[PDB]
Write a protein that binds this ligand. Sequence first.
Ligand SMILES: [Mn+2]
Length: 228
Amino acid sequence: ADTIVAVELDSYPNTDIGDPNYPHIGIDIKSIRSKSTARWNMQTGKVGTVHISYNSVAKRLSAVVSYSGSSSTTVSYDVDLNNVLPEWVKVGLSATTGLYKETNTILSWSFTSKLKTADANSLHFSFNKFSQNPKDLILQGDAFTDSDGNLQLTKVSGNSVGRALFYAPVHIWEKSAVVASFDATFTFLIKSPDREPADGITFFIANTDTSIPSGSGGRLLGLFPDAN
Ligand SMILES: [Mn+2]
């Protein structure tokens, strides 16, 4: 099975004892049951941004979500990712929709990874516009780029799932390493006639051969085959 680390924005009704009772941002380590959560004050119709960072010395994965002119929400979790992920990964974005009329539009996405064993080894990319046949993205499921230069992760006019992976593998650790780190950011627009629709969007890190697991729609965010 796939090895998943993710930052989720999640407004599906969460059913298990001990889950948040509100839309939330969370940090997921190999399971849908988040290791750490905070309230997500969701605003359909308005552009939002997520920032994510991690460093192998601090060993603290942190994320923040915010909207223009509003207060931001943060979440953090202490973890050694070398004990969880393989050395080579792929990074990506995912979204799912419930029985609602909503869009999951990504307007921009950038990423940086550094690895020190000599100046460091590194990789950086930024998409502020998405082109129509993007040969440096692996699109899975329903995901596609429209003619306005936007990345649409789920179907545009129910129950959709789609993902976009950066094409090249990322080197996040090696045995002779001093420190490694990564940063990511993306901006998103959730359009809907409803104010609080059940929806999901993630940034994630996986084994390089990852694909959409069978039965992973809705609350499993296109990342996990089951809730255990
Ligand atoms: Mn959740």
